[PDB]
Amino acid sequence: YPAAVRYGVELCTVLTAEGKFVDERGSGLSARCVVNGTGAAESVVFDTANCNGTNTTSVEDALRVAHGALRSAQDRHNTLAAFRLGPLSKQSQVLLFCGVNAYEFGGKYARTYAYAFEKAKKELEATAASGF
Amino acid sequence: WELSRDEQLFWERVELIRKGQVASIGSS
């Protein structure tokens, strides 16, 4: 199970989603953006074929189109990853919530995991990593 | 709850592995 979650996280990091946005203020500005799994953009292109009347668009309007094309493509990647990593994480919660007696922190060993949690906190409280 | 289950698993295996001395009767 922890190797499959790592396999899914590494997969969606390198993949590719696309999103478009058309200007709502009358201009025919269309921007298409390609966004990876790190949040970065691979290609930003503008489309001027829809708008023939030009020289009335400021640079603030063109940044507002590109802000919408990035927001649409980043939400496209977040929805595609929610269906690739979706059903695996749903079967994960059945295996873990109803299978605590098969794991190292359920049953008689829940007292050890709680003891090691409090002991890890005091070692951060002895330094200023917690109390600051 | 685990300690009550594992203790009953303990003494049910002591009965399985090593039997104790049998009391007396009268033969017919």
């Binding site: 919530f97 | 003494w11 009965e15 009268g26």
Partner: protein, 735 residues
Amino acid sequence: RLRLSRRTVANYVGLINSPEVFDDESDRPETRWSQDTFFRECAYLSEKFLKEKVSNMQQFEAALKRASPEAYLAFFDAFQQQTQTQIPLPSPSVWHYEGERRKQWAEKFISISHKAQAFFKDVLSEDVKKYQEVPGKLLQKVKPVLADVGKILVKRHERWLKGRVWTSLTEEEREAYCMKEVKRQQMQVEDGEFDPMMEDDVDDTELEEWQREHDAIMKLMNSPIDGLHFTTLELWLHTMRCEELETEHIYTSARVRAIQVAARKKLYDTTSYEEVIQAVVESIARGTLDLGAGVLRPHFNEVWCQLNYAKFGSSTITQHTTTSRRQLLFFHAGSLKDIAATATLYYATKPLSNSLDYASPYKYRRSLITLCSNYGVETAYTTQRPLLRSAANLARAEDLIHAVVTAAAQPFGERRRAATRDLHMEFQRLAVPVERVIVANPVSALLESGADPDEKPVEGEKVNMWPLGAKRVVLYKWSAPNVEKLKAMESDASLTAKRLREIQELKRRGFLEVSLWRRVTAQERKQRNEIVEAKKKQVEEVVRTVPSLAHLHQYATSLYSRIEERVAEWEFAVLLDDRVLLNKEESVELYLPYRDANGELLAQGEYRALVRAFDLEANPNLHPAYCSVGYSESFQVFDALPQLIAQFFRVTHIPAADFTPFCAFLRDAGLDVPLRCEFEAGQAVTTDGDVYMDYFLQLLRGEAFHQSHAQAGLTEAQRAIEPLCRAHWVVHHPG
């Protein structure tokens, strides 16, 4: 564990993980009591110490209760088999109280329990005999007597409270009152007083108030009821006190006394003192009085289990076998149903009980197995309780969450379907519309020897009835300028490779989308509207009960405003074709399937054909509002398969020579049966060679050998991910 505690297991060696046990001599029903292993160990010690010839298990435990305390100890010093089933139960105090405490307990308990056995032989034996018709009538006669005693106890507790709320006390003060109650119950067991005097009340005015309370209790305790000859104090003295005198090690030991203080505090923190007194009387009223075992078996209520938790769920249990005399530590009852499970087997496996059979040693085993078989399922429900009940509420919470976020998606689909209707009216005004949308009959290309191949005389005129599995040719007239360009180029064309490539690229310049829409009967409109308000009030009852789900409805509307792509009676039944290429003849054959793309059988009623036209040049990326929409005339769609079969056969089997003109009869009426459905139907015959009709129609009403024109161009790899990509399309187009 019953077979393993006897002499016969000595002749067997076993696997510890999964021991297959032997057939004991008590497993045979013909075995008398003289051949019993465990009885002969008890019949030997009865003649030795109890000095009584014993011939039955009924005669053994009866003679055990006739015995004297000098003989009751001498038998139990040489008897080592306390438990046979190895289930941890509360025990009599002969297995506790090492040394001199064993002897003075035996002089106290056996003399007192002889008074209780004399109390059950004639006094209570005639009272259950009088009310033997319907059970429970004896303790309901004691029920109104004990309720007036309990109102004095609440008033005494309310006087100690002095008005303040029990929750608001200091934690030391809660244990201070709980320390007095456990020492009061210790004096009820030892001194035999129902309301004993403690040295806590040193005030003279409180002593006068306590004396009026103590004398009103003793007047109620000595008040005889009419139908029953015994008073309610002598019922408590011989049923309730005599059972807890047997387990006096629970009360005398100071370690278990500290368990009862912490058990009474958890009872009083979640439950008021007025409710714990009513449940004590309900535990005595609802119950069963045993005459042979000599015990009053209470209700085992949830307040009763919290009262007697240290007796049935603590580490006070000491097992004594032939192998080892062990003191069980860390014994813990998880829930309050385990105390109800432990005390059920504890009171049913008392000596001379009615649950135990004493006719044969075989019947004594089967009565004892079932008492532990019913106890095991009660413990199997306990270990399954906290993880499955928390899995049921967690599965319930997702279905309510799925209902809330679907109810928030429907207003987003209504405003989107209305806005694409408004933009379609502005587009269809200025664009080229489609005019003639007429459904026509399919013509046969086959012709006789006298007919001319170049004329093409007939093309069909109109269709009033379209069956389910039948083809009909639609007629469209689209006046787009690319249509008139290809009509001149194809009529100009013997043929070169560069000219045929120009024909194919002009067909892909535009297309048409043809769909089939069903009319809604106003009776079914009232049926459809009745269910969508049945869920709407169902969702709103869920939202008001769970305030977290009201917050999640606001999350779904705010999330759907971000994800959804912004846009700036008849009902759809079947999509016929996705892409209809541009044709010079302006006619395509459209096959209706039996099942739609959703996968259900189509109903009957009025159906009209909806034709939308698209052009990739003037309308890039295929916006749904920018199209040329035309409507056809209404027709009737139903199934002819119950009709044409009943007209042919005038049924469960189809003969061999009858099947080949049967499919030609289906083709004569307009239905399309393919060669693949015909050939594979002949593979499943009977011993007479009869083709099944249900096998033939299941291959006819399937998507195997004939498909719609929409699903014909798609890949199986695309069709497999089709419900997966549609759900990704629903979250971006909610509703």
